């Protein structure tokens, strides 16, 4: 009356990931800042949801100082951020 | 003299208006000239 039962089992695997898409940071011309500004200006207040959101996301000093009167200075912003405004607007213009 | 500033910027004013509260784009609209001739 005696038994012997050894059992050892140890597993791991999790290498499924894919997300790293970088911004272009492309040279945005001054004419493109003005055009972009006008194209966002013709978009109504609830379309401005993403617009202001990515400006507060990049620029934290505006977020804390003025959550009310948020000066989105297109001509003096990041060309990466201006590409995010570019991505949004052209997706919201060019249907299909 | 003027010393007027252009600046390509839209001041998004977080306002509450209508049945649906919306915030709208504006700018720093002070120091009006509004036509001249006697100058």
From Swiss-Prot, chain A:
Transmembrane domains' residue ranges: none
Tissue localization of expression: Ubiquitous.
PTM sites of type Phosphoserine: 19
Domain NET stretches: 18-96
Domain of life: Eukaryota
Subcellular location(s) of the protein: Nucleus; Chromosome
Linked pathology: A chromosomal aberration involving BRD3 is found in a rare, aggressive, and lethal carcinoma arising in midline organs of young people. Translocation t(15;9)(q14;q34) with NUTM1 which produces a BRD3-NUTM1 fusion protein.
Role summary: Chromatin reader that recognizes and binds acetylated histones, thereby controlling gene expression and remodeling chromatin structures. Recruits transcription factors and coactivators to target gene sites, and activates RNA polymerase II machinery for transcriptional elongation. In vitro, binds acetylated lysine residues on the N-terminus of histone H2A, H2B, H3 and H4.
Family, per entry: Belongs to the BET family.
Domain comment, as recorded: The Bromo domains specifically recognize and bind acetylated histones.
Record note on quaternary structure: Interacts (via bromo domain 1) with GATA1 acetylated at 'Lys-312' and 'Lys-315'. Interacts (via bromo domain 1) with GATA2 acetylated on lysine residues. Interacts (via NET domain) with CHD4 (via KIKL motif). Interacts (via NET domain) with SMARCA4 (via KIKL motif). Interacts (via NET domain) with NSD3 (via KIKL motif). (Microbial infection) Interacts with the Integrase protein of Moloney murine leukemia virus (MLV).
Protein name: Bromodomain-containing protein 3
Origin species: Homo sapiens (Human)
Residues of the full protein shown: 554 to 640 of 726
Curated annotation (Swiss-Prot), chain B:
Motif KIKL per UniProt: ranges: 9-12
Location within or outside the cell: Nucleus; Chromosome
Tissue-by-tissue expression: Highly expressed in brain, heart and skeletal muscle. Expressed at lower level in liver and lung.
Modified residues (Phosphoserine): 5
Subunit structure of this chain's protein: Interacts with BRD4. Interacts (via KIKL motif) with BRD3 (via NET domain).
Cited function: Histone methyltransferase. Preferentially dimethylates 'Lys-4' and 'Lys-27' of histone H3 forming H3K4me2 and H3K27me2. H3 'Lys-4' methylation represents a specific tag for epigenetic transcriptional activation, while 'Lys-27' is a mark for transcriptional repression.
Domain description: The KIKL motif recognizes and binds the NET domain of BRD3.
Family, per entry: Belongs to the class V-like SAM-binding methyltransferase superfamily. Histone-lysine methyltransferase family. SET2 subfamily.
Disease implicated: Defects in NSD3 may be involved in non small cell lung carcinomas (NSCLC). Amplified or overexpressed in NSCLC. A chromosomal aberration involving NSD3 is found in childhood acute myeloid leukemia. Translocation t(8;11)(p11.2;p15) with NUP98.
Protein name, UniProt field: Histone-lysine N-methyltransferase NSD3
Organism: Homo sapiens (Human)
């Amino acid at each position: 009356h005696h038994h012997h039962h050894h059992s050892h089992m140890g597993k791991q695997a999790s290498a499924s990931y894919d997300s790293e898409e970088e911004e272009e940071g492309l040279p945005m011309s001054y004419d493109e800042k003005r055009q972009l500004s006008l194209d966002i200006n013709r978009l109504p207040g609830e379309k401005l949801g993403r617009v202001v959101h990515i400006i507060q996301s990049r620029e934290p000093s505006l977020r804390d100082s003025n959550p009310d009167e948020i000066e989105i200075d297109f001509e003096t912003l990041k060309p990466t951020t201006l590409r995010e405004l570019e991505r949004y607007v052209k997706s919201c213009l060019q249907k299909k | 003299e003027f010393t007027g500033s252009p600046e390509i910027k839209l001041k998004i004013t977080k306002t509450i208006q209508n049945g649906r509260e919306l915030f709208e784009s504006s700018l720093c609209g002070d120091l009006l000239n509004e036509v001249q001739a006697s100058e």
